[PDB]
Design an enzyme around this catalytic site. Structure first.
Site, PDB file in Angstrom:
ATOM      1  N   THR A 278       0.558  -1.317  -0.109  1.00 37.03           N
ATOM      2  CA  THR A 278      -0.052  -0.015   0.008  1.00 37.03           C
ATOM      3  C   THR A 278       1.008   0.941  -0.094  1.00 37.03           C
ATOM      4  O   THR A 278       1.235   1.846  -1.083  1.00 37.03           O
ATOM      5  CB  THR A 278      -1.328  -0.036   1.145  1.00 37.03           C
ATOM      6  OG1 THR A 278      -2.173  -0.754   0.891  1.00 37.03           O
ATOM      7  CG2 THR A 278      -1.783   1.228   0.934  1.00 37.03           C
TER       8      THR A 278
ATOM      9  N   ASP B  15      26.691   3.233 -16.625  1.00 36.52           N
ATOM     10  CA  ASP B  15      27.753   3.973 -15.785  1.00 36.52           C
ATOM     11  C   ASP B  15      29.446   4.576 -16.119  1.00 36.52           C
ATOM     12  O   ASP B  15      29.213   3.979 -17.737  1.00 36.52           O
ATOM     13  CB  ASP B  15      29.083   2.240 -15.150  1.00 36.52           C
ATOM     14  CG  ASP B  15      28.002   1.387 -13.787  1.00 36.52           C
ATOM     15  OD1 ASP B  15      27.231   1.956 -13.452  1.00 36.52           O
ATOM     16  OD2 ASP B  15      28.347  -0.180 -13.920  1.00 36.52           O
TER      17      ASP B  15
ATOM     18  N   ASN C 235       5.857  -2.192   3.392  1.00 37.40           N
ATOM     19  CA  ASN C 235       5.583  -2.081   4.704  1.00 37.40           C
ATOM     20  C   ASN C 235       6.027  -1.917   5.848  1.00 37.40           C
ATOM     21  O   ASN C 235       5.377  -1.243   6.183  1.00 37.40           O
ATOM     22  CB  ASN C 235       4.039  -3.542   4.286  1.00 37.40           C
ATOM     23  CG  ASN C 235       3.377  -2.954   5.897  1.00 37.40           C
ATOM     24  OD1 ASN C 235       2.793  -2.033   5.782  1.00 37.40           O
ATOM     25  ND2 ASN C 235       2.639  -4.228   5.785  1.00 37.40           N
TER      26      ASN C 235
ATOM     27  N   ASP D 161      26.128  -1.215 -15.300  1.00 33.99           N
ATOM     28  CA  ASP D 161      25.083  -1.015 -13.722  1.00 33.99           C
ATOM     29  C   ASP D 161      26.271  -1.732 -12.422  1.00 33.99           C
ATOM     30  O   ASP D 161      25.091  -2.256 -11.972  1.00 33.99           O
ATOM     31  CB  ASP D 161      24.553  -0.906 -13.726  1.00 33.99           C
ATOM     32  CG  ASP D 161      23.327   0.100 -12.894  1.00 33.99           C
ATOM     33  OD1 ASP D 161      23.742   0.646 -12.258  1.00 33.99           O
ATOM     34  OD2 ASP D 161      22.195  -0.449 -12.600  1.00 33.99           O
TER      35      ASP D 161
HETATM   36 CA   LIG Z   1      24.789   2.602 -12.781  1.00 29.70          CA
HETATM   37 CL   LIG Z   2       7.716  -5.478   3.372  1.00 29.21          CL
HETATM   38 CL   LIG Z   3      32.723   7.124 -19.288  1.00 30.63          CL
HETATM   39 ZN   LIG Z   4      -3.472  -5.360   1.860  1.00 27.52          ZN
END
Ligand SMILES: [Ca+2]
Ligand SMILES: [Cl-]
Ligand SMILES: [Cl-]
Ligand SMILES: [Zn+2]
Ligand SMILES: *[C@@H]1O[C@H](CO)[C@@H](O[C@@H]2O[C@H](CO)[C@@H](O[C@@H]3O[C@H](CO[C@H]4O[C@H](CO[C@H]5O[C@H](CO)[C@@H](O)[C@H](O)[C@@H]5O)[C@@H](O)[C@H](O[C@H]5O[C@H](CO)[C@@H](O)[C@H](O)[C@@H]5O[C@H]5O[C@H](CO)[C@@H](O)[C@H](O)[C@@H]5O)[C@@H]4O)[C@@H](O)[C@H](O[C@H]4O[C@H](CO)[C@@H](O)[C@H](O)[C@@H]4O[C@H]4O[C@H](CO)[C@@H](O)[C@H](O)[C@@H]4O)[C@@H]3O)[C@H](O)[C@H]2NC(C)=O)[C@H](O)[C@H]1NC(C)=O
Ligand SMILES: CC(=O)N1CC2(CCN(C(=O)OCc3cc(Cl)cc(Cl)c3)CC2)C1
Ligand SMILES: [Cl-]
Length: 806
Positions: free
Chosen positions: A157, A689, A178, A681
């Site tokens: 939520t 990167d 949560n 990454d």
């Molecule tokens: Ca990165």
């Molecule tokens: Cl959670």
């Molecule tokens: Cl670079």
């Molecule tokens: Zn719920």
């Protein structure tokens, strides 16, 4: 000191400062309300509806709402007042008429926005509960609607409401679940509790703050649990009667249903019909009240959910205790996802490598899969936050994970839950927009909830704070736009190098059996190194490089790249495989063949010796030799400039994709265009990167090792036209495969690649936009399509779930 009074201050919009008693819709949650709040501000006398006998009554001030003559003037009639007392019709009973222009009372500077948000409202309710939700179904069919809207992970939520509010991924906004622990704070955060009110948890800039800083007033987004829904509607309608200089422009309403029931009875339990009737009734109240105030063809209304609901029972719990002996050394954040850390950071004992290995493929039937967070599929964007534990469990739909069984029976009462992967159909939720600014009777394709912040800003005349939406991607929801997106400018222009080097200048340790070498096919291969078949291999323009770098465009009979002099490998490789094209093999004498590229210097090339001396690391090709158009063109695929580093374990995935699946896709879709490339990454932030962030090189070299490999696979949506001659809309699917030295993620990987490879690729499906962030490239620059449509295309995700929506 809470000794002042709420007389004529009920639901004041400017929260005042302690000590002085507060009369705003949050005071309950701070235990700071004035003593007379309840009496004055939470009246219930006589319920929430007018009857024929209350009509033209003598205004009595003790009533929860009024049916007196003066009530329109006071702004506090019951929602059904005109219906019962003045022979008017309910909004739902009226035919729907297009609202081509706002129809706003004097003083309204702009159409107000009302966000009606419903907890646990699964997408398929729009069809399955259609018979009992007449107001909602009117909104849906008269306004703009999607078959569903995709929440963010985890499908809880708070992460989802605050994503709706900010346009950001939870990893960025900071509400990653949560419940959560933050080590820099040393503190926890729970649904219940007062710790969660502290500002330091909450990043980004939510809509109500974006509004405020730009001169637009906002009603509260947070309502107190103990203020009933009918009072919350009346409060919004009161606020809407304030004078021009005090009246907010944006409002929110929250419903605890149908989540609350759904946890008890499951998504489709018989007990679920009445919660849905109630929501609808509430919507009816709102629209009737809007129509009393003559705002019903003025206000834009958004009916939006946070997440869905799945069937989940106690007996579908996996226990960590049956996989680990050392269960007391850990903490589990439990349920529909798992997050594990050390129970005491006193310890140089606890070891994450062993924990993971103890949870990998240990039972045939295993209903979860452990991951280091940086190996989660990139589409979840669930890693770049210190509150996200390094160890994550992705749980099968319909299951739970717990630490031990006492945890589930002493710390079955529940048939529904949520929190699973955000591609799961059960977790999908809803979107409807209705009002002047939205389209009329229009269905739009499914989209992700991160995109809404932009649109709500647009609906309000606001400039959005930086967010993870693609602004423009949802312009197709709106009758009148106000934001016109444009393509980012290219930053680095390519070099077009010619033949500049003699083979003998290369000392790369690279050999090929290729010296079995006509005026016909020497003009021919000159046209192919200049760019003659580039019209069939590069269909949507060259990608733009959006950062400063040095790179070369290389043309070939069968493909075009792409080629980075800094990273020593292509950024991108583009090629078209028509429906009719045929697969061949790598002849044996060419197995180990790597050739120097005479367009590219020795010093900006990879070398084969580094791979010989690196026992963990082998190599593969971005344009596959297997799909050469001729034996002569196949030599092109062995150029050192088409080579990239690949763990042997990963080569099994990659060769199968190249050798089998590309051809299968071209069969099914009537040609595909493919762009493939590497991704770096190392700091798992979803962003490309810089070179100084690379943590691994091919040993003894400056050749960096990619974290992932991507492909974007484009064809014609109308598949009766071939990919290389498409007149209209495009269809795309893409992935970002993690470059791993083992196939521990695939529990059947010791079987034939036909049993496990494609399943992995589907888990790692991606939007073209995800790849853009990770590469600093911009795709689809030269099409015949509107830019809006292309932005829509770039945000599409191919999910591989069966028939879904509402
Ligand atoms: Ca990165
Ligand atoms: Cl959670
Ligand atoms: Cl670079
Ligand atoms: Zn719920
Ligand atoms: C999804 O969308 C988001 C939003 O666009 C993308 O996230 C953004 O990405 C940017 C690049 O990564 C990043 O820029 C950083 O920011 C550093 C400072 O940031 C703080 O200020 C932010 C601005 O708030 C204000 O906004 C408006 C204007 O827009 C103002 O008017 C208001 O007054 C606002 O206050 C603020 O949002 C940001 O919040 C984060 O951090 C808080 C931590 O306390 C959290 O509460 C909050 O939830 C945010 O948390 C996320 O982001 C942090 C990183 O910021 C991350 O660690 C968390 O996991 C979490 O996910 C900040 O408070 C700035 O200092 C950075 O600069 C460094 O690098 C550059 C490199 O060129 C250098 O120029 C510079 O020298 C500097 O280096 C120095 O530091 C190095 C290491 O720290 C050190 O080694 C070096 O030697 C130097 O000393 C950089 O510009 C944005 O902040 C970030 N924004 C958000 C909201 O997250 C995201 O990428 C998108 N995702 C995808 C996949 O596309
Ligand atoms: C502590 C607790 O159990 N709960 C808080 C809770 C959710 C948040 N509440 C809200 O009114 O939210 C409206 C809202 C709408 C939108 Cl689109 C975005 C946000 Cl951030 C909030 C209040 C009720 C349920
Ligand atoms: Cl393997």
């Amino acid at each position: 000191a809470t000794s002042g009074s709420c007389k004529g201050r009920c639901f004041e919009l400017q929260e005042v400062g302690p000590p002085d008693c507060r009369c705003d819709n949050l005071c309950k949650s701070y235990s700071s309300c004035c003593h007379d709040f309840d009496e004055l501000c939470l009246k219930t006398a006589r319920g929430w509806e007018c009857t024929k006998d209350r009509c033209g009554e003598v205004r009595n001030e003790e009533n929860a709402c009024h049916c007196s003559e003066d009530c329109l003037s006071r702004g506090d009639c019951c929602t059904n007042y005109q219906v019962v007392c003045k022979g008017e019709s309910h909004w739902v009973d009226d035919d729907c008429e297009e609202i081509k222009v706002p129809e706003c009372p004097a003083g309204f500077v702009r159409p107000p926005l009302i966000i009606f948000s419903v907890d646990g409202f699964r997408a398929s309710y729009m069809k399955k509960g259609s018979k009992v939700m007449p107001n909602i179904e009117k909104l849906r069919s008269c306004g703009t609607h999607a078959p569903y809207m995709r929440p963010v992970y985890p499908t809880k939520t708070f992460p989802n409401l605050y994503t709706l509010a900010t346009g950001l991924y939870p990893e960025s906004h900071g509400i990653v679940g949560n419940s959560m622990y933050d080590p820099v704070f040393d503190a926890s955060f729970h649904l219940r509790g007062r710790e969660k009110f502290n500002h330091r948890w909450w990043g980004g800039q939510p809509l109500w703050i974006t509004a405020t800083k730009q001169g637009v007033r906002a009603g509260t987004f947070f309502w107190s649990v103990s203020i009933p829904h009918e009072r919350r509607i009346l409060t919004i309608l009161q606020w809407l009667s304030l004078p021009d200089n005090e009246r907010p422009s944006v409002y929110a309403f929250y419903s605890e249903q149908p989540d609350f029931s759904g946890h008890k009875y499951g998504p489709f339990g018989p007990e679920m019909t009445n919660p849905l009737r109630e929501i609808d009734k509430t919507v009816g109240q709102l629209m009737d009240g809007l129509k009393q105030l003559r705002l019903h063809r003025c206000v834009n209304v958004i009916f939006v959910g946070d997440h869905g609901m799945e069937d989940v029972t106690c007996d579908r719990t996996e226990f960590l205790s049956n996989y680990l002996t050392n269960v007391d050394d850990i903490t589990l954040v439990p349920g529909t996802l798992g997050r594990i850390r050390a129970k005491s950071i006193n310890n140089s004992k606890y070891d994450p490598k062993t924990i993971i290995a103890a949870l990998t493929c240990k039972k045939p039937d295993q209903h979860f899969k452990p991951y280091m967070k940086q190996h989660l599929p990139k589409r979840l964007h669930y890693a770049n936050n210190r509150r996200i534990e390094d160890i994550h469990l992705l749980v099968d739909r319909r299951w739970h994970v717990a630490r031990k069984p006492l945890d589930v029976y002493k710390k079955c009462f529940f048939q529904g839950d949520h929190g699973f992967d955000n591609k799961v159909n059960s977790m999908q939720t809803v979107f409807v927009g209705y009002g002047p600014t939205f389209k009329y009777r229009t269905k739009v394709p499914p989209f992700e909830n991160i995109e809404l912040y932009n649109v709500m800003c647009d609906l309000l005349g606001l400039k959005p704070a930086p967010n993870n939406g693609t602004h423009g991607s949802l312009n197709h929801l709106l009758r009148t736009n106000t934001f016109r997106p444009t393509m980012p400018d290219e930053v680095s222009r390519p070099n077009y190098p010619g033949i500049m080097y003699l083979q003998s200048e290369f000392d790369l340790g690279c050999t090929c059996d290729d010296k079995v070498e006509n005026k016909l096919e020497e003009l021919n291969k000159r046209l192919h190194t200049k760019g003659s078949t580039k019209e069939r291999h590069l269909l949507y323009g060259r990608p733009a490089v959006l950062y400063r770098t040095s790179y070369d465009i290389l043309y070939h009979t069968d493909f075009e790249s792409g080629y980075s002099e800094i990273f020593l490998m292509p950024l991108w490789t583009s090629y078209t495989i028509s429906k009719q094209a045929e697969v061949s093999s790598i002849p044996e004498h060419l197995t180990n063949c790597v050739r120097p590229d005479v367009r590219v210097s020795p010093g900006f090339s990879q070398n084969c010796l580094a791979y010989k001396n690196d026992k963990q690391m082998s190599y593969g090709f971005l344009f596959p030799p297997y799909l050469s158009s001729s034996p002569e063109a196949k030599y092109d695929a062995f150029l050192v400039t088409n080579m990239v580093p690949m763990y042997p374990a990963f080569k099994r995935v990659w060769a199968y994709f190249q050798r089998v699946l590309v051809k299968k896709y071209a069969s099914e879709r009537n040609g595909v265009n493919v762009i493939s490339g590497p991704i770096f990454d190392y700091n798992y932030d979803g962003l490309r990167d810089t070179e100084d962030e690379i943590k691994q090189y091919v040993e003894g070299s400056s050749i960096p090792v990619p974290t992932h490999y991507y492909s974007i696979i484009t064809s014609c949506l109308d598949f009766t036209q071939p990919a290389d001659k498409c007149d209209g809309p495009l269809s795309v699917s893409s992935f970002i495969l993690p470059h791993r030295p083992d196939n521990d993620e695939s529990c059947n990987s010791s079987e034939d690649e036909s049993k496990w490879v494609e399943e992995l690729m589907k888990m790692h499906t991606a939007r073209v936009r995800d790849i853009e962030h990770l590469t600093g490239l911009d795709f689809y620059r030269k099409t015949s399509r509107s830019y809006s449509e292309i932005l829509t295309l770039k945000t599409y995700l191919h999910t591989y779930e069966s028939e879904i929506g509402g």
